[PDB]
Design an enzyme around this catalytic site. Structure first.
Site, PDB file in Angstrom:
ATOM      1  N   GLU A  65      48.614  42.787  37.620  1.00 35.71           N
ATOM      2  CA  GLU A  65      47.774  42.213  38.680  1.00 35.71           C
ATOM      3  C   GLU A  65      48.297  40.844  39.103  1.00 35.71           C
ATOM      4  O   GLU A  65      47.913  40.330  40.154  1.00 35.71           O
ATOM      5  CB  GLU A  65      46.310  42.080  38.247  1.00 35.71           C
TER       6      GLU A  65
ATOM      7  N   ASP B 251      31.758  45.482  28.526  1.00 29.78           N
ATOM      8  CA  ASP B 251      32.692  45.271  27.426  1.00 29.78           C
ATOM      9  C   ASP B 251      32.198  44.105  26.576  1.00 29.78           C
ATOM     10  O   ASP B 251      32.448  42.944  26.901  1.00 29.78           O
ATOM     11  CB  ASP B 251      34.104  44.995  27.949  1.00 29.78           C
TER      12      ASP B 251
ATOM     13  N   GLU C 225      39.239  34.914  33.818  1.00 28.66           N
ATOM     14  CA  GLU C 225      39.757  36.042  33.044  1.00 28.66           C
ATOM     15  C   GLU C 225      40.823  36.782  33.873  1.00 28.66           C
ATOM     16  O   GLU C 225      40.566  37.842  34.447  1.00 28.66           O
ATOM     17  CB  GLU C 225      38.617  36.972  32.586  1.00 28.66           C
TER      18      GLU C 225
HETATM   19  N1  LIG Z   1      38.613  39.116  37.187  1.00 20.81           N
HETATM   20  C1  LIG Z   1      38.857  39.770  38.388  1.00 20.81           C
HETATM   21  C2  LIG Z   1      38.401  38.929  39.567  1.00 20.81           C
HETATM   22  O1  LIG Z   1      39.406  37.931  39.882  1.00 20.81           O
HETATM   23  C3  LIG Z   1      39.506  37.899  41.329  1.00 20.81           C
HETATM   24  N2  LIG Z   1      40.762  37.433  41.911  1.00 20.81           N
HETATM   25  C4  LIG Z   1      42.015  37.938  41.698  1.00 20.81           C
HETATM   26  N3  LIG Z   1      42.912  37.203  42.404  1.00 20.81           N
HETATM   27  C5  LIG Z   1      42.213  36.183  43.091  1.00 20.81           C
HETATM   28  C6  LIG Z   1      42.594  35.130  43.968  1.00 20.81           C
HETATM   29  N4  LIG Z   1      43.953  34.951  44.315  1.00 20.81           N
HETATM   30  N5  LIG Z   1      41.649  34.301  44.467  1.00 20.81           N
HETATM   31  C7  LIG Z   1      40.354  34.470  44.137  1.00 20.81           C
HETATM   32  N6  LIG Z   1      39.953  35.467  43.304  1.00 20.81           N
HETATM   33  C8  LIG Z   1      40.879  36.332  42.774  1.00 20.81           C
HETATM   34  C9  LIG Z   1      39.315  39.323  41.736  1.00 20.81           C
HETATM   35  O2  LIG Z   1      38.882  39.438  43.084  1.00 20.81           O
HETATM   36  C10 LIG Z   1      38.253  39.765  40.791  1.00 20.81           C
HETATM   37  O3  LIG Z   1      37.021  39.537  41.312  1.00 20.81           O
END
Ligand SMILES: NC[C@H]1O[C@@H](n2cnc3c(N)ncnc32)[C@H](O)[C@@H]1O
Ligand SMILES: NC[C@H]1O[C@@H](n2cnc3c(N)ncnc32)[C@H](O)[C@@H]1O
Ligand SMILES: NC[C@H]1O[C@@H](n2cnc3c(N)ncnc32)[C@H](O)[C@@H]1O
Ligand SMILES: NC[C@H]1O[C@@H](n2cnc3c(N)ncnc32)[C@H](O)[C@@H]1O
Lengths: 342, 343, 343, 343
Positions: free
Chosen positions: D132, D31, D123
């Site tokens: 999410e 993207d 992001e």
């Molecule tokens: N942009 C998406 C990325 O963000 C990561 N992610 C989502 N929640 C998370 C979290 N609570 N701790 C560490 N990484 C996280 C998620 O695993 C993905 O790799």
């Protein structure tokens, strides 16, 4: 001589044996664009030849000498290093021009000429213009040129443009994928995939193409053969900055060239551009090992560097970068051994 | 060395540069006939290889060495003169075979091997079998072969046959007639028409063809590599006498070759005959300067003489005559620079 | 229960959530081939249902139960583990069939039934037949089956055959080549090129194809559900030996399956073969990471090994070899996460 | 941990499995809008990064960390909870940045960081921005942020607008009317038509659309991540009052979002508006159960309420009323399971 100083004996022998064949002379001559354009340039600038002394470098069959004779030259010294020299004098005799055309067998770097000349003519252009390194023999011959003399061709233009051709890129990768095999007749070739990919992408692709694959206005590098010196061609650095007209993947750079015969009466151009009628030079394309994505409006900047080697050719290193993203690509090419796709 | 005295450096450099390309190895390797038959020959004769010392002359990528290793060889010395050798050592390492395959960079006439070997393997055949003159390196390597040693391939068959192909013959004049015009851009080229013709007829034509163009059963000349010497290949005289099966004009001679791998268990053939599946060798045809008319039943007798040159190839002299009519024809060819016509 | 012991809760939750949607029931029901074929099998074998007790495993919307009721079943026990069970009872009521169809909410491994049954009906087939591992629930249900009872479907046939599709192979290699970039926004991704290839080629390709891409007649592996036990489905080893009909590159193996409803009156087949009309199952293809070259007449031997995992699917290991040359290729695929290529 | 108390394990397992695939990292990275804008924001505000400590939340492949390194960061702590972390450390080594980038596997709510940081980058935006529920992890990370620290992105704007799409609205009934037939293979499905309708309307539609369907200037709700608390994101109440630009039927609300990177040198915007080039976030539309007629100039007032659930998503409650007519419509949606309509 300066020629042996810059050339491996192995390559030179091979080079001049190649040009010793009449079948090759025929191939060259049946290029109407090339032959016709040379004749137009000479005859329409006939006053630059009338009652003058001419030197023809690499006359081959001697066709250019005959054009000069038609234009009214007083005397043409035609220098040729291959065994073609013997066939040339046969034509000179059967055309009753022995009083005007004198064939001198040998390399222009090694022969002795009776006098200085008013104009030098030649066809020193190879693939991408610079291949075969004949341009240095052309400039060497300037030692026999009068201060007020002229050169045909007078100048050369290299043109560069970025292109997109998914089909060409996949073609080369389909071939390299042979070496990714884990068990070819029970043998693991995979250790060599890296070597294989490099080798295949080291090949400049010679063929023609539709101009709609071009993604930006071309960049020009000009060589003026009248003021340039031999030393100038050992290392040619062509910097470029493209302003992208279309978004997409850039798979490489396209090369073609123009030469101009700048005579007293008029200027005649000889072009191998893809917008122009096809020639035996076609066009040349250099693929990147990895394509670069660029949006329309982005700038693609970098350098094309040609370094002369002892095999009568150049090693090409191309570095390109999308200035906004920093996405960079490189490639090293062997101009001596192209891939003819036509 | 024995190699440098029979080769101009100019030709040798260009020769080994050519074979230094992986793309060239790939072309050879993707010839299923060539590669498959070699594997069959070696593997089906595993008894000739199990626990033996092997020498692979011009291993290139090393493919044949690996086959010998699969067959159970104790040790393979793989000799390669091009820069392909540096790639070979890489494959041997990545395939875990460094204890058994030893890559020796250099020309077989110049390198020293630690020990004598039980069998020599190689792919020395060029166009018409003899092109590239690698067969002399193959036979040279016999200095390292134990008495009672074997050679793979063991024998070679060159085959000659007269053919008729009016369009091939006429093609050559259509090309040369370019030079027969009094004003090409105001220049009279006709003076070179003769030379052009000569040039085109000195080129052997490489391509394939329908076996129905053949005018007689072929004649074969055999080289037994087990008894042959290097000196035997400098001058090859192939006399022939064809008994014509069809009436017509004979425009030249067609060449192809067979090699046989004669092992303890069985004999395996590799053929480039036009009746067999195509290979990267194809077939070769040499035109006469003037066709000869022959009746069915008439006899076409003559000689094919091959003289080795220092450009790693041969000069071919063919003279033939119809015995019943006395009609005679000859030609001189330079095998080094053939005309690849296939399409 | 036996289900929780062979399943991760995370996977089970998502699985039964998926089938809780009426939109998915609709997709299954609008497969005319599937639904029509099931109705043909049940109704044309109505004698196997008339005045019998039926168990319908995973009735979903309840459609098969209604077929059984139409065929004359005295009573149908319909077991469904998703919330779809609540919707099924609504249809049973609006169709006035409460006297014949009884919905039992729960997993077939967990519910209690009042009596033994004469016949079990179900649609336990997933992609490649085995995906979703419902066949084990189907076989579990045999604990409620009378000794001389029947099963609809009765048997299953897996068909595998080698294919050639240069465009499919390069498509996946094109996608993986993103990770070969030496400077993506100034970052070198090439270190992950290997991981990328593995991940992309680990995906079975779901779509349809022209039967002419098949390189040999298919091999069949049969599962007879009447004699099979659950333990038989934990590890499925499918050996194969193909006799190549065409020369060319083999890029992988194609899979499809047949199931047969063997009733008293006739046998009805349900096929997802590419020669037959398309179903929501399509066909499945597994690419080799590297293609294998085979001539016509050669034999392609190897194994397809299926090992059930705790995510309600299988890990697929395919090893293939050209017997004559020794050319070998492998691949590991994760059936749970396919690549849907369909238009 | 703070993460596990607000998330059911089932959803969390599936969530991090998803981001463990290189294929999705590739999808995000290709993207140009997203990746290009992030690089622009970071590099053009290089003074905000040179020789400072950076925390990258959910680095995934680590792309954002490399940007921070390019801008001159002294040290970057890169946190990743999925298996992508192992791939991230591989890239760090092959790009020779082990002296500056430290990959920390684990959830940002659970890991230990040695020190306070100058700036946090990430992001964390999903569909409709909030999907999410990662924005809460982003704000959690501020416990490691020094006062006067910065956040990239610094603020987020969700945008709301009424739209008209008669075909989209009617599509849902065409699908549900499948169930309105008295004899589908002899079964009366009509009893489930209502349930089908309800199901389809609870699904927000993910795709893009022509801006000509928009009926009013959008209303925006701003989240400033520098002062915001995690608690602010559990219940988001977005009241709206639209002044209609066009007369017609309003079928629902369209959602998109902007984020801004407010650095010392300049502000860079990343927008998913339908007026802008498409991104992998697309836009989101939520239907009303009944359309509302509104004249141009009239006011459409109501509330959009987002309530966080344990499935890492939101339940959307939309209430709208035409003030001039008293015409009222509502809807309740589950953002966790959208309907991808694109192409
Ligand atoms: N942009 C998406 C990325 O963000 C990561 N992610 C989502 N929640 C998370 C979290 N609570 N701790 C560490 N990484 C996280 C998620 O695993 C993905 O790799
Ligand atoms: N255009 C190619 C023709 O020019 C001839 N040529 C190349 N290098 C030369 C050289 N150094 N001196 C004289 N003739 C030369 C070369 O032999 C060929 O005939
Ligand atoms: N099959 C062709 C291969 O054989 C190699 N070759 C030819 N003459 C050779 C020679 N004299 N010594 C070592 N390798 C040789 C040649 O280099 C090429 O790699
Ligand atoms: N054919 C698939 C249909 O059958 C249901 N299903 C899957 N596994 C099941 C199981 N183990 N017990 C009862 N119903 C099951 C599943 O919910 C779906 O509706």
């Amino acid at each position: 001589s300066v020629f042996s100083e810059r050339t491996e004996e192995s390559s030179a022998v091979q080079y001049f044996q190649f040009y010793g064949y009449l079948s090759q002379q025929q191939n060259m001559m049946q290029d109407y664009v090339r032959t016709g354009t040379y004749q137009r340039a000479i005859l329409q600038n006939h006053t630059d030849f009338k009652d003058k002394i001419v030197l023809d470098v690499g006359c081959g069959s001697g066709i250019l000498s005959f054009f000069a004779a038609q234009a009214g030259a007083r005397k043409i010294y035609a220098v040729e290093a291959s065994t073609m020299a013997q066939h040339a004098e046969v034509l000179v005799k059967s055309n009753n021009l022995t009083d005007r055309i004198v064939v001198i067998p040998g390399k222009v770097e090694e022969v002795s000429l009776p006098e200085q000349v008013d104009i030098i003519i030649s066809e020193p252009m190879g693939y991408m213009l610079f291949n075969e390194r004949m341009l240095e023999s052309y400039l060497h011959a300037k030692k026999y040129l009068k201060p007020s003399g002229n050169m045909f061709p007078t100048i050369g233009d290299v043109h560069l443009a970025p292109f997109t051709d998914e089909q060409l890129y996949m073609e080369q990768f389909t071939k390299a994928n042979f070496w990714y095999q884990p068990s070819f007749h029970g043998v693991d070739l995979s250790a060599l995939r890296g070597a294989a990919v490099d080798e295949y992408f080291r090949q400049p692709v010679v063929d023609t193409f539709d101009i709609r694959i071009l993604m930006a206005k071309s960049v020009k590098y000009t060589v003026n053969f009248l003021e340039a010196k031999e030393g100038d061609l050992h290392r040619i650095e062509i910097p470029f900055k493209f302003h992208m007209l279309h978004s997409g993947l850039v798979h490489g750079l396209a090369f073609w060239f123009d030469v101009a015969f700048i005579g007293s009466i008029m200027t005649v151009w000889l072009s191998t551009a893809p917008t122009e009628p096809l020639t035996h030079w076609y066009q040349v394309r250099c693929l990147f090992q990895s394509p670069l994505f660029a949006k329309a409006g982005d700038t693609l900047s970098g350098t094309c560097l040609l370094i002369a080697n002892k095999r009568q050719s150049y090693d090409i290193s191309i570095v390109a970068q999308v200035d906004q993203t920093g996405s960079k690509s490189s490639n090293l090419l062997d101009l001596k051994n192209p891939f003819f796709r036509y």
